[PDB]
Amino acid sequence: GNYNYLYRLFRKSNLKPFERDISTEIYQAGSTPCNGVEGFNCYFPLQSYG
């Protein structure tokens, strides 16, 4: 798995034409919204390409 390449999975909003989404934006992945809280329901922002 070439994990050097990754795809963003956490992104609160949409994107604009030619937007650098380098920022590791975090959005809830379970039930409790993150809202600045890390740990539960807040996984890695992006997933490696297996």
Binding site: L9, A29, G30
Partner: protein, 597 residues
């Protein structure tokens, strides 16, 4: 935002993680199947632990979501497929005990060995020793000894284990909101929230019973013909009205009667439909089998098939250094990865088996676009029927003649058609009464209907009624003969075979109707019919995204379970059996037994 939106995001994340995890597990599984080594078993352990831990974690994370607040049908289906916790619904100790009992029971069934009394060192397992030996050798004494020993050295040990396993499987089902573990397994067919398609778990039982009583005259006539042939073979071992022995059916459980075909051939002088000689002469191979099969699918409108399967999958024997399992299997490893477990030699049985496995693969990537949970069949019977219908269509003489395997000079007379129909009956409906009998007995055991200190006896009793087959020698309640089968001993539902046979008959009839086939149903070839292929793919692409009853109504036009396609298929054979049984009593009598003088 809302709880439903949070559940959707959680399901998306779960799908994203589970796709990769299942892909890695399936890759490891294919490597282990193609290479049985210690490190391969190690990565089985690792992949199984990872998959189980992730599945339990996501089951809990779906559980805290109240299923009532979600209104999207797909999200509801995915959550209810995930919200189930299985044996973990009980205490951890109870779940561990149930798992250990299952492991011990499966080991005892798989390692079930019987030793001849005259030779203690001569011990043979159930497979491939006992089954093949008594299927080929027709000796009454040897078959009876093998049957009794197999059901004794296994059933006696498995009876307390079965009683624990049963109640344990039941208590989880209970806590899982189910009257019994039979209801837990029937919940797969349950449909909820769909107007005009909702299905109750007991409705499956009622439909199976209705279909069984519909086929009852045909089954009775087939039993009468088999009894007449056995009279021609072993007149002194069976009563003309008594039920057949359990060891004189081709298998200890009586599931498959095809081994009796040699004893029950209608026209022995008439050759069987077999182009294996031409298969060798044409210098074809499993690759050529796959090529002809792909051409057939092109004729029915299916698209071309990816070369990645060709490179990854194996079609012949890979020598012996890379030891590989020859059991027929289809593999949807995920993310466009598909594989086949076959050892197809230059034969016709392996030809049809490879056809079936590849058709399973075709059904698999038909619904590949569905999400990870929905990348599966609607029920436990639809998956096999998809392969069954196309295997039957490709096994028809018309397809063989078109592909050149069968010479055009071959003629289809009445005797050859009767032989083919009787072979198909022995292969298909020789287990349908047995499937209903065992599933109902297992259902009874889980629903506690049957009585323990009477269970086995009750078994034998309706063995004399549902099956019309009586045990050659009595078996006490210490015997656990039903648990001697793989499905009971490995926690597998048994009604799947009955349902898949019904679905295959219905789908074949629907395909023939859409293809405007003229002639008998058993001679129907769906080749060169793109409309039927598209209609089939319409359900195939859905997978389990839609109710299984909805898929059946969309394909065959009938939502309720029925054997009308089976009746159409076997009507000439039904008339032939009725004519042949003019002298032999049709049915059975429960009074007579081989152990009664």
């Amino acid at each position: 935002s809302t709880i439903e939106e949070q559940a959707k995001t959680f399901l998306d994340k779960f799908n994203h993680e589970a796709e990769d995890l299942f892909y890695q597990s399936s890759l490891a599984s294919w490597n282990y199947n193609t290479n049985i080594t210690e490190e391969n078993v190690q990565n089985m352990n690792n992949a199984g632990d990872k998959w189980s831990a992730f599945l339990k974690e996501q089951s809990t994370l779906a559980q805290m979501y109240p299923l009532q607040e979600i209104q999207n049908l797909t999200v509801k289906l995915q959550l209810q497929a995930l919200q189930q916790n299985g044996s973990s619904v009980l205490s951890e100790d109870k779940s561990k005990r149930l798992n250990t009992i299952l492991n011990t029971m499966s080991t005892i069934y798989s390692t079930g060995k019987v030793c001849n009394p005259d030779n203690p060192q001569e011990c043979l397992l159930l497979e491939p020793g006992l089954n093949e030996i008594m299927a080929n050798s027709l000796d009454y004494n040897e078959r009876l000894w093998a049957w009794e020993s197999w059901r004794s050295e296994v059933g006696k040990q498995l009876r307390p284990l079965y009683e624990e396993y049963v109640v344990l499987k039941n208590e989880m089902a209970r806590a899982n909101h189910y009257e019994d573990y039979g209801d837990y397994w029937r919940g797969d067919y349950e449909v909820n929230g769909v107007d005009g398609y909702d299905y109750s778990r007991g409705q499956l039982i009622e439909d199976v019973e209705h279909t069984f009583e519909e086929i009852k005259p045909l089954y009775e006539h087939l039993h009468a013909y088999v009894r007449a042939k056995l009279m021609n073979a072993y007149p002194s071992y069976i009563s003309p009205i008594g039920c057949l022995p359990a060891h004189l059916l081709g298998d200890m459980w009586g599931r498959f009667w095809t081994n009796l075909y040699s004893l029950t051939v209608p026209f022995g002088q008439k050759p069987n439909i077999d182009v294996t000689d031409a298969m060798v002469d044409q210098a074809w191979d499993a690759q050529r089998i796959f090529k002809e099969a792909e051409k057939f699918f092109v004729s029915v409108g299916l698209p071309n098939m990816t070369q990645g399967f060709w490179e990854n999958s194996m079609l012949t024997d890979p020598g012996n250094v890379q030891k590989a399992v020859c059991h027929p299997t289809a593999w949807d490893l995920g993310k466009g990865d598909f594989r086949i477990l076959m050892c197809t030699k230059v034969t016709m049985d392996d030809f049809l088996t490879a056809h079936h496995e590849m058709g399973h693969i075709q059904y698999d990537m038909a619904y590949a676009a569905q999400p990870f949970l929905l990348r599966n069949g609607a029920n436990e019977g639809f998956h096999e029927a998809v392969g069954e219908i196309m295997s039957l269509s490709a096994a028809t003489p018309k397809h063989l003649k078109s592909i050149g395997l069968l010479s055009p000079d071959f003629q289809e007379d009445n005797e050859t058609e009767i032989n083919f129909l009787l072979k198909q009956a022995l292969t298909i409906v020789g287990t349908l009464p047995f499937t209903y009998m065992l599933e109902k007995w297992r259902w009874m055991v889980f629903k506690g209907e049957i009585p323990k200190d009477q269970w086995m006896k009750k078994w034998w009793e309706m063995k004399r009624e549902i099956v019309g087959v009586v045990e050659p020698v009595p078996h006490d309640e210490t015997y656990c003969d039903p648990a001697s089968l793989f499905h009971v001993s490995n926690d597998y539902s048994f009604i799947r075979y009955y349902t898949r046979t019904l679905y295959q008959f219905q789908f074949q009839e629907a395909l023939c109707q859409a293809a405007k086939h003229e002639g008998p149903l058993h001679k129907c070839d769906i080749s060169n019919s793109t409309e039927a292929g598209q209609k089939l793919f319409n359900m195939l692409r859905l997978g389990k995204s839609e109710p299984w009853t909805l898929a059946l109504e969309n394909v065959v036009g009938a939502k309720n379970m029925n054997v009308r396609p089976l009746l159409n298929y076997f009507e000439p054979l039904f008339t032939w059996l009725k004519d042949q049984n003019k002298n032999s009593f049709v049915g059975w009598s429960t009074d007579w037994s081989p152990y009664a003088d």
